[PDB]
């Protein structure tokens, strides 16, 4: 709807299968041309480059993708705890760009390559 309350509500209360679209990131120029898509559902295998936070400019492998909080963990994009331990600093996929893909899955690869359905 056009109402802000319903818009935010449908986004926060979206079922698991609908949360995949909340972890989508734009593709690099090459990848866009190769698959005929502007963006993709970030996977825990893809390589990504940070374009917005304090980590803008850094690249790394996506180590985790949490659908519940619709956020991602990327290698070396971390914060140092008080005890010295190093923990990940979650990222919103919209502040990120996919530079390499993990196509170990036949289904994902087939999904990306087809013209009718995106991925």
């Amino acid at each position: 709807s056009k109402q802000p309350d319903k818009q935010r509500k449908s986004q926060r209360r979206a079922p698991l299968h609908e949360r995949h679209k909340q972890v989508r990131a734009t593709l690099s120029a090459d990848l866009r041309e190769e698959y005929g898509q502007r963006n993709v559902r970030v996977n825990a295998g893809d390589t990504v480059e940070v374009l917005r936070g304090d980590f803008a400019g850094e690249e790394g492998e996506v180590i985790n993708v949490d659908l519940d909080k619709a956020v991602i963990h990327v290698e070396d994009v971390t914060l140092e705890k008080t005890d010295g331990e190093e923990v990940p600093r979650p990222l919103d996929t919209s502040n990120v760009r996919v530079t390499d893909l993990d196509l170990e899955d036949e289904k994902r690869e087939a999904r990306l390559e087809s013209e009718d359905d995106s991925a």
Partner: protein
């Protein structure tokens, strides 16, 4: 008077008689009244729950306990308008008629007057529209209705030295107040009105501040948004002719 017709390239292509209605004396008061009505007539009825604050058997103790005769329940004041959690004394009411009537003749007169304000370049500029042109309204060939791409209309507007207005409307304002919480965060300047004859221009509609309309049903609000006369308009040769007998 005579209006100059323009082709899809922006070059002069003959001219036609500007219909008599455009000579109708500009009447901002009548136009404003007509707009006030259209705006009111779309407002939805509202009102608080008729039983709000009344769902309590609260009673007053009366005299004897050194307290005000205010209805209480479980030691809490209830129901009365001065009591927190009590009823609303004179709240909005659903039964209220929020519509405004307007005589057909009086409204039609305003439509004609708004049409005429469109023919005065000084007025159109006074309203706020940005454009480098002497003639107004802008008249174009019926082939305009065949355009498909928004950008092909941009080319035409630039060629007609009327695109400056779209730049003016290409600035959204984030309103002050709680309208934001109800879906009314943005607002923007009103730009060009495109009046065609068969179907509203799909190609011109997404233009910043643009409004599309058809000659048989274009209204006072199309011609004078917010009640302000003199909107920068662009008719279609056929539209310009049909708008004559309104």
């Amino acid at each position: 008077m005579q209006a100059t017709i323009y082709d899809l390239d922006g070059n002069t292509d003959g001219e036609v008689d500007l219909p008599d209605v455009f000579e109708t004396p500009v009447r901002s008061d009548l136009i404003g009244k007509a707009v006030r009505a259209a705006q009111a007539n779309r407002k939805q009825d509202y009102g608080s729950d008729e039983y709000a604050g009344l769902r309590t058997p609260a009673e007053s103790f009366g005299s004897g306990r050194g307290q005000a005769h205010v209805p209480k329940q479980d030691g809490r004041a209830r129901r009365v308008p001065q009591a927190v959690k009590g009823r609303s004394a004179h709240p909005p009411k659903t039964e209220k008629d929020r519509s405004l009537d307007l005589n057909d003749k009086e409204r039609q007169l305003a439509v004609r007057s708004a049409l005429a304000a469109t023919a005065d370049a000084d007025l159109v500029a006074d309203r706020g529209h940005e454009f480098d042109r002497d003639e107004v309204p802008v008249v174009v060939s019926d082939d305009f209705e065949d355009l498909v791409k928004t950008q092909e209309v941009v080319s035409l507007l630039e060629a007609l030295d009327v695109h400056a207005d779209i730049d003016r409307a290409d600035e959204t304002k984030i309103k002050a107040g709680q309208g934001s919480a109800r879906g009314r965060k943005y607002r923007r300047p009103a730009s060009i009105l495109f009046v065609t004859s068969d179907e509203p221009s799909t190609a011109a509609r997404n233009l910043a501040g643009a409004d599309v309309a058809t000659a048989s049903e274009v209204n006072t609000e199309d011609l004078a948004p917010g009640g302000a006369p003199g909107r920068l308009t662009v008719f279609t040769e056929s539209a310009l002719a049909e708008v004559a007998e309104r």
